[PDB]
Amino acid sequence: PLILGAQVSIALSTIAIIFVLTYFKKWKWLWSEWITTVDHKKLGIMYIISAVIMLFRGGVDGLMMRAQLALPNNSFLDSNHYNEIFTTHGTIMIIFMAMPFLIGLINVVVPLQIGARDVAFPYLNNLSFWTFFVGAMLFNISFVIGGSPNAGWTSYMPLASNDMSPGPGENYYLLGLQIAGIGTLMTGINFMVTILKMRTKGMTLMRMPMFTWTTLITMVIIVFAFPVLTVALALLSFDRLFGAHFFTLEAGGMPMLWANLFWIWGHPEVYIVILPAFGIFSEIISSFARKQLFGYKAMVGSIIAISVLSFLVWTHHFFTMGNSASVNSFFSITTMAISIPTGVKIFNWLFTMYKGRISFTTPMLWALAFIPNFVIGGVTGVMLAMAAADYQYHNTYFLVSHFHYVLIAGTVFACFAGFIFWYPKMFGHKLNERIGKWFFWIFMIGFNICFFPQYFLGLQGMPRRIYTYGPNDGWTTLNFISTVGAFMMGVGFLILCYNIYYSGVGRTLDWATSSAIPPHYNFAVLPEVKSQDAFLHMKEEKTELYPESKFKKIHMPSNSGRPFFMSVAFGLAGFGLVFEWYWMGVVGLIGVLLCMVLRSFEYDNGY
Amino acid sequence: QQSDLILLSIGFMLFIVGVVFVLFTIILVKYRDRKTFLEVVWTVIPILIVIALSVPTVQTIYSLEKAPEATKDKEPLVVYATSVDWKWVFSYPEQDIETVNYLNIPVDRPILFKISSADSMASLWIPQLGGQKYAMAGMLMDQYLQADKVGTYEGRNANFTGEHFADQEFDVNAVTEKDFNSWVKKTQPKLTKEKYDELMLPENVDELTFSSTHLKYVDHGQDAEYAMEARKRLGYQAVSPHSKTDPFENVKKNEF
Amino acid sequence: XXXXXXXXXXXXXXXXXXXXXXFGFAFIQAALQLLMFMHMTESENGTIQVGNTLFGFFGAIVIVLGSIWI
Amino acid sequence: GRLNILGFWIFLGAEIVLFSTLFATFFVLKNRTAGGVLPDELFEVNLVMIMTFLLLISSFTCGIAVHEMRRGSLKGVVIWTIITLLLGAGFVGCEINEFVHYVHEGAALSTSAFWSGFFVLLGTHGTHVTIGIFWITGILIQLKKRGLTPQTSSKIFISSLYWHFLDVVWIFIFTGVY
């Protein structure tokens, strides 16, 4: 409670700083060219700049976790604080960090590499940012205003309603993600049609090239693995507030029923975080290498395998709960059939990097370290699929050590690769390379000495979600070495922010723009392409440019201020139901009232 | 430790894969600086890596079902295991005995652990027995175990965290048959009827011998609704800030 | 005119559905919606339109039969 | 040409997974009610509900085909879309009185775990058919200062097929819960 007293004053200070320094007059630039802007280039900027903001929130939380877990009998965080900090840390990632960072690199790079103007529905994509942002402010306001959840990012039901006890705890996790699920669902519907009906002439479907193909698969799983989360929380939101007994222990309801609904959404969404991570690395490893992505009949054919085979495997996070044995072997054998369509994708980057030349820049280092570190984590999840042995290393850090190797090397590096490799798109010049190598090395070496001792921590006998280990067989140093590596990755985020204070070998429509920071209309003429790689075939072979007198009219999809008011109504209705208001909400019904009025405004505006 | 052989043997299988990609990168790359048939032929080895495990693992999933460690189909000992918050409860249906946060089992004897929970989901890990089974509040899950050698086996929970969950470590011991038969015949306080309801509150507790089995109360493996009649009958529901300390109304058995 | 043939035939499926109670009864339900939805998918934007709902019912079988599978 | 007919079409494929999750929840919570009321509902109300909705699409399967596609009954839009709009209130009014009559033992989601799914599997079900009426009448405000022609006023078709997607799970609910 003493620590949470300073941040509420700092949170008020940052809001007070905005009024004096920034709000001299903002109804001309912030409300016009931003907030409710329609250009996809500006929307994706606000996506990743929020994920970087959440990186520091999840950073101080993730650091003080391992700082608390430096050695036994440590008294940094008590029980009800280490339970809230580690839960907030996991939920800020994946949902509020990797999702806005990946889509942010998708809502910017994908519409340029296809040649189209904007996206299919640049109006619904506007609210799809604020729909997440009001869900981010909802989950973030649980700092001092109410109470952060303390049941983990999974947050099982039997320890979430009355057995939990904090009223405004799980409610934030329920209403915060329920709103962000609406915006993310529309993000997968917008790009599924943008890449299917808005491609330029000549951009064939089988070659467009492969990163935009992963985005195509990314937005396919979103459409079919997010309505689950929409009702899975809605069912849980009815248990907490409206008094439903779907999974309550009292009225007899199945406690484990909420686990399968969350994991039916869980593992398919687990690939939605690794699919664009694979795509971003697919280009950077095949752009600076000056070669061709050798393999499409078995690489794009392999990207459709994990697209449909992601819903026949989700029952591997269970196993321990004693299922029908045969069903614990069905999803155990099937999980092995998912590391093969993913396994062929690693043998496709090393043979796209051989015979051809290479030059190790900063975006290459993120692709250089992505190859081993993701495999070192992948050669551990293969053991997790073995249900006969999953009972031994279920939870107990070895689970945590496996996935932290899989996702931080997969997506967080891709979030850093696309951050620098496509930074000249965002503004002039780029990051200083030499001191950027300082950020790579320290962040890379600290990543191994943080979770590889966790492989020993978990196998020796250290479970997860524990605030004190105790002198058990001298296993103290392994928990401290993991913390040293945990704090070594902390050193660098200063360098990362220091590099932003300063304020190419393209093979696709990346640098094919008219200049740096591309204009609003993006590409005056649509490229004919008619090849697998447009930029290389439009450089040495002939030239092909944007000739004058061949221009035409504009697009004209101007801004509308409703998405901001539409998401505020969701944020107002969600916050009202969370912060107290157990049975019903006085202002929660108004948010639905304001939303349905704006949904009448949806089909009452002619443009 | 029957599935432990899978752990050690599989470790070298991926140790090779970890070094194979050391050969697939470090051998070249450095040499190559400025200063269709292989993929289809590769589809013969990837199943060969997983199909060598997609059979012994399945031959073990079905192996842990029927009668496990060292007994064919004899000596059936049953031990009802129930999980309240933080605290562990074990009742023997063979003779009216029930232990709390402690358990003794004779070596080389089949034990049919009936796994259940009271208020929150849990699972008796016990890193020396190998496989763990979730304690599902509402139904009993059967899981057989045994003891390798005589010693002090550590024990913990899956730790679905909830304030008091990291200190769920309950020490168990496995001694000889002759020393186990004299342990039952020494103890068998009693089932005080009310002290059972005095257990569902989550705090800290010591040994608590208890020389009487508690399964005469709604089975507990069934009718998992024994959380309202527990915490609420003694007038207690916690919150997050202030006015806790089990919202007044005392009577319990704590630490110190 | 042509839609009245399917609409009249659909009414017989619901009437026959009551006779089942008052596999064999799980296919007439999808067959009712096949005739209901086959008059408005293809084409132009088709293939993708009628294909999007094809693997969608796959998940419905995977989710339902998968939840009951435990 | 409008791509909203396809963009708001894959959303109809997403609602298949939306109702399948609720169908998975309900089908696992079927054998419960260990302490409470056993489900005994009116049979004739179910057929009147379904036969009204099966005739709802009967007046809607031919409600845009022989309307805008075949010939051009621009005056019938205040006839075919209005008559089919009154049938939407038939399912709302009947299900409301069905829920109100269920207050007599088995009210809301508090009596039993089984009734929680039934009132929600038919809840957002009832919400989807309720907002559709406010969506079908939202396009009827076009035959005034607008009055657009077919192949341009896509608001009717994209809302008609969403309204058709209801009867998909509406019948699957008939075999699902009953």
Ligand code: HEA
């Ligand atoms: C995207 C995925 C992702 C990312 C990026 C991270 C980031 C980190 N995580 Fe986490 N983690 C999870 C996924 C992730 N985590 C999940 C899913 C859980 C469990 C969820 C749950 O069940 O609740 C979890 C919880 C978790 C655990 C296990 C909890 C337990 O079992 O008890 C551990 C282990 O040490 C950990 C450590 C770290 C560290 C050291 C980082 C580092 O990357 C830290 C990164 C930090 C920065 C980039 C900024 C550095 C900050 C500063 C420089 C500020 C310093 C200034 C001051 C202190 C004033 N986090």
Ligand code: HEA
């Ligand atoms: C980006 C997200 C992501 C990705 C891509 C993966 C990928 C995989 N994961 Fe994992 N996983 C998580 C996110 C992810 N996971 C999270 C968040 C958790 C914890 C959730 C929680 O409880 O909070 C988790 C935990 C988890 C579990 C549940 C453990 C439990 O019960 O508690 C399982 C079980 O099967 C698993 C296995 C796998 C496998 C087999 C793959 C495969 O897809 C990996 C494929 C890679 C390889 C197979 C190696 C590369 C292949 C080759 C080099 C070819 C040669 C190799 C062979 C032939 C073997 N991981």
Ligand SMILES: [Cu+2]
């Ligand atoms: Cu998984």
